[PDB]
Amino acid sequence: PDIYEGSPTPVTAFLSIAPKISIFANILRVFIYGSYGATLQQIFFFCSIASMILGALAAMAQTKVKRLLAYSSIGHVGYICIGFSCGTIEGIQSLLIGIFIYALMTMDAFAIVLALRQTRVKYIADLGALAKTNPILAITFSITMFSYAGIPPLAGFCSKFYLFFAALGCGAYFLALVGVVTSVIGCFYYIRLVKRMFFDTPRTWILYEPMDRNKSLLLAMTSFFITLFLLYPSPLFSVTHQMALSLYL
Amino acid sequence: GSKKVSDRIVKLSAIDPDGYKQDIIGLSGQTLLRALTHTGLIDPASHRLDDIEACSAECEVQIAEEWLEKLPPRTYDEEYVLKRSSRSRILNKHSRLGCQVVLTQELQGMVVAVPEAKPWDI
């Protein structure tokens, strides 16, 4: 969390996405041979449970946007490691789908943060009257927050859904309960942000300057992906199942 | 007569860290941080919002011992914010929060000592 907070926001955007894809690829290509007595499956089991619990219980005590994003990243790392704990094609597929969806949501959220970083946004209360000054950026940020929460209609629900399915496939019922409780806590502290934008009426407002074309296009594309992913999710599942099988043959 | 702005003008003595005493002007009904912002002692870009949750004790002030009894007692949130940012997890027993001190006509001549600045960019 300290590294994420102190790092520059464009830098923090890259470290939150790129170093995870490659490292997860390495961990998979280590599991293909290093499955020695299911030793890593226990380690990743404990790590995933602890990660979900700690992220959920730590992101509720955060007032800054970047620390909350860091703890969200930790929680989603635990949610992905659920897939590691259950070694099966449908577990690795859930892991890869979760990685993809989490990377897209993180890119969306960090583009939103960088859009507001031109006015030096630091606290969640700063984005208080955003629903009045920029009533479409508030909608986009609320969509991203709900996707983090895992609300059914959005794309963030598919990853958690299929990860829980994979966890129940191997028979780890304890993982499912911890995931459910952590999901409830995460959804609470994610809708807390949505409460600030729309429902509060602060005395002092902070006016932000409009973003540029690059971030506007990126936000538009990612927001259309997040809301309309459930309608056509077949290509992602197909490519993910193809990748999971190719790890061995 | 009529309603004058001087009818709610609070005269204060603010000491910046190097020991210089300059007289600042505030409005009764607004936070002491706002009063310090007018002259420029505290950078307005660091504490743009006068709210407890949007604060990391960037408005910390040192109120005089005899001038602290005529103020509301520190709340739990104020103490919690003060302790974390102290860099030593200690309480000065005379340090308040600028955003949580509301000026009043009974605060005429309150002597406040502004500590050194702290980084707030990111």
Binding site: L54, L57, A58, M60, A61, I185 | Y80, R84
Partner: peptide, 26 residues
């Protein structure tokens, strides 16, 4: 409603997460 159902409900005593999330700094 206002008593046992609320105290054992989501905010009468389930608001201990404030006394639990804030302790995560340890």
């Amino acid at each position: 409603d206002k008593g046992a159902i609320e105290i054992l409900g989501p905010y009468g005593i389930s608001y201990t997460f404030r006394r639990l999330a804030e302790r995560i700094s340890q």
